[PDB]
Amino acid sequence: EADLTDWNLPLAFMKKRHCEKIEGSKSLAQSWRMKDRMKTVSVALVLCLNVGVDPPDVVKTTPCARLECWIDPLSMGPQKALETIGANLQKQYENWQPRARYKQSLDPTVDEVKKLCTSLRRNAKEERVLFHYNGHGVPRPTVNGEVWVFNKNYTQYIPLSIYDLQTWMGSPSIFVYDCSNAGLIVKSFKQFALQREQELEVSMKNCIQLAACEATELLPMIPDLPADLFTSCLTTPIKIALRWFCMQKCVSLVPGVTLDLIEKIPGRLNDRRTPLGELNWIFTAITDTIAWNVLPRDLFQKLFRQDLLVASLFRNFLLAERIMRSYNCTPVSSPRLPPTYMHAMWQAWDLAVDICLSQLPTIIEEGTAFRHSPFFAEQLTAFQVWLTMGVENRNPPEQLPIVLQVLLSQVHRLRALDLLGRFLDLGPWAVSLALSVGIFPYVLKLLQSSARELRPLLVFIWAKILAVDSSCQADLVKDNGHKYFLSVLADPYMPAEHRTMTAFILAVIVNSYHTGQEACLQGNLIAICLEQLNDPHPLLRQWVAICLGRIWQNFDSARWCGVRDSAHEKLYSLLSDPIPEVRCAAVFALGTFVGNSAERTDHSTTIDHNVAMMLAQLVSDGSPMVRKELVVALSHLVVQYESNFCTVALQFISVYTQIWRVLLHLAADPYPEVSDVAMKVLNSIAYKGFCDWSARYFAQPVMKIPEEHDLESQIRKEREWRFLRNSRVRRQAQQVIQKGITRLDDQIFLNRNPGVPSVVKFHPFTPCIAVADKDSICFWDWEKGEKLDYFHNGNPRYTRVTAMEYLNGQDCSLLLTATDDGAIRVWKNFADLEKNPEMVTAWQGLSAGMVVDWEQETGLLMSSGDVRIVRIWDTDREMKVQDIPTGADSCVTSLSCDSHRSLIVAGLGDGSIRVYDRRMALSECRVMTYREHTAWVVKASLQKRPDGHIVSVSVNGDVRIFDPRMPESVNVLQIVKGLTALDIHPQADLIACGSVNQFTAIYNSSGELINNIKYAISCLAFHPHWPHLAVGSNDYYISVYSVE
């Protein structure tokens, strides 16, 4: 049942589900646009300490090691001390920002400070300036933040207040306070700034501050640590970190590790292969990880992205917090951060350090080669394990700032790029995250990399970025970029998928950037496009055509070059592609070609005229995308041809006449949107898209697993149960047939019709009673008889419904409703009609009423009969029509085809049925003339039985059955006498005739007629599977007759 009932039978408007997705997408927040670029320019080194002078505030002890900058020459005397310490602070600050302007001041007083601040302001006024106070060897600051200058005499003190410095330091600035009670200074500074801002109402928000510890506590004295512990932590993190690590571990699990080895570690701290550089590399990764994972976005960008020096200082500040906590000191800063020293990531740091030190013996000692750490490999492993389920409704990975910096090396770069690509399958969500974290300028720099093996990854990455960040204003194009992708597409050996992605990238570059529309001409993209038209890949041909069109847009020279290489003719040869999408691309490109002709005329107007004709023939196409893009392209043509339609429009109200015919045919098409747009174009002239979908495709996830490949999917179960229902309904009908059939003396259905039951049709399963009036299709529930809603067909006043059919015998078919004027209105939404009456579409079947017969197992649809000919539409490809010129002389009939062969039957004409096999040549159309019905024939049809006789009805009522191979061999019954129609049921011994009076007549194949069944007649309809007869009476009721 369901094993075979689930046929491989697609619906003719299945592709509509994809074709009507004419939509765009959304943009991004684009927080990466760091419009604030305020850099730091200069630094001031205020070394207020006086060597050898012990303030009264302090009482030292024997282990007061007073190292500052790791250098304690109290032996050498004061002058050497000051010189050396100043030089070392210079050298240390240069390690983080060499390019600044450094000014030193050792034991300043007042005018020195004023002059220094004035010079700093003169040098720059918007760029930040760094300032820091030492602040050792001076008394403790007051409640006013007063700071004791000395006049080369410790008794000659001057307490400079905060206000003088604020006045002197007006520009943006960073302050660092290595005092004892520095938090007091920060607090008083903020109060003073509030007072200054209040006076300005009669500088805040332009000031960063870092403080050693809280106002109510003093710096500690430790025998082993430097006195300038906070400064060293902010300035030289590695040395103090390792030294603290060796001093602080409660139980040492690595014997042999000692400070002598720590003071001899080989490296540079700027070479990732060396030990110390690797240790910096790990340190930087970990600290950025914590900072990104604990803060909100804006604070993160302000502290870690606007400026290099600020980012470095806060990166070290986190370590400063960790170390200071163990000695009862809480560092203090401008805008406060959450507490961070419980974060799990710190454990990783410790482990990493151990591993390096675990091999530091026997490297220094014996020269054994250094081994590299497994840290980044493990982090990549964790990121991959998160990807393997990759749900987006939860937290993002914690390791993303780590892979960002793994990209910057040249060891793991391929694997990181692969994992980033997988992360960017994926949705706009992942794109937004990976954009916000950064990454993209580094990829822009990788575009210039010489490694061609990086090509397929980068393309794919960019293929997603531009797919989401469509508004990107081509920073890649500025640094070549477009040329790189031109060379990429120039490769024929690259896979067709990557060629298609590169074509899309070039298309977006040309679309979204005018200098891109120039660079495409600079590199000769038109020739490459015309070369790439020779590929079976559909999307590649579409993007080739779209690139050509966009190139031709807004440049006359491009249009001239397209003429020069006969680009338009090669594009015209693309119109032989069965795929509607590629032909839409060709239509768009040709319309743009003519539109950008600029009305230069010369000889090329002929070419333009040809291009109009090149599209005109496509009115014969029934494909909806093609029709819509044809009316759009015709708008792109008439934008120029309206210069001369001012005269020609009177014909509608050579080339121009054919354009009027084209636009009127598109107006006459039953499809609503095509007709409406064509009428708009016609009105606009007379008074005087797919590209979005194609770009939308790439941003969708790739490597999707269909829902129907999930075995436990609800779709599979629902389909199986529906097909079992349909199969069992058909099996019940088969049981009725096999058990024997009596006269249909029982009733199933009897209900009012609001109007004429002109046509009656049903399903080959649970047969929802569909009946057509002149201008509507009304439905009734068959098993119960409940009346349902109706679809109003919008038919003209001179138009009836002449036939109906379905597009599937097993699945959710779309009911076709064929009307007098050649139109067919289509919808599957009769299913759950009470809930979803939204009909689908309409189209033109014709160009005896109208009748349609769908060939279910071939994908064709045969159409009749207002024309004298037979029209064979194909719906599984380019929606064209084959015109078969039969020998009929008038409107022909309801056609039928015995699917075993290409046999067609036709005729209501001059006394003959015309039957022919289409395999013969379709210019003779040899037809078996069945002349026994010399009268006006009625309802020529085939038996679907193996016997295959020809059924015939006369206008006079004669009913006859011809042998297909012998017109002379016939069986004659002549049953329709006082009766209105005929309807044989080939699966049963039942043939209905209706009546002219208030009854119904049925007869068996032997001719045995009854005329007394009551449960004139417009319509008779046997169910396609049940041996039950439906009577669409002329009293505007409907009734179903059943076997007893």
Partner: peptide, 8 residues
């Protein structure tokens, strides 16, 4: 421009 000394 870059905050880090990248290897291209």
């Amino acid at each position: 421009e870059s905050q880090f000394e990248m290897d291209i």
